[PDB]
Amino acid sequence: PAPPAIADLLASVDSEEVRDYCRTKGWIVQEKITKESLERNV
């Protein structure tokens, strides 16, 4: 629910299961990126 509660949550207990758990509840949303919206330099 509360975004600051989601932040303090993941800090303490973080694991792939918790990430997958939160992923399902709709609390967190995995964002896909691509070739664009990405840039390179020397």
Binding residues for a second copy restricted to 1-42, rule: CB under 8 A: 1-2, 5, 8-9, 12-13, 17, 21
What are the angstrom distances between the C-alpha of 42 and each of 35, 39? 18, 11
Angle at which helices 3-13 and 16-25 cross, to 10°? 160
Binding residues for another protein restricted to 1-42, rule: CB under 8 A: 3-4, 6-8, 10-11, 14-16, 26-34, 37-42
21 binds, among a second copy, another protein, none (CB under 5 to 8 A by kind): a second copy
Q: Which amino acid is at 14?
A: D
Tokens linked to 30: 């995995």
Residue ranges binding another protein (CB under 8 A): 3-4, 6-8, 10-11, 14-16, 26-34, 37-42
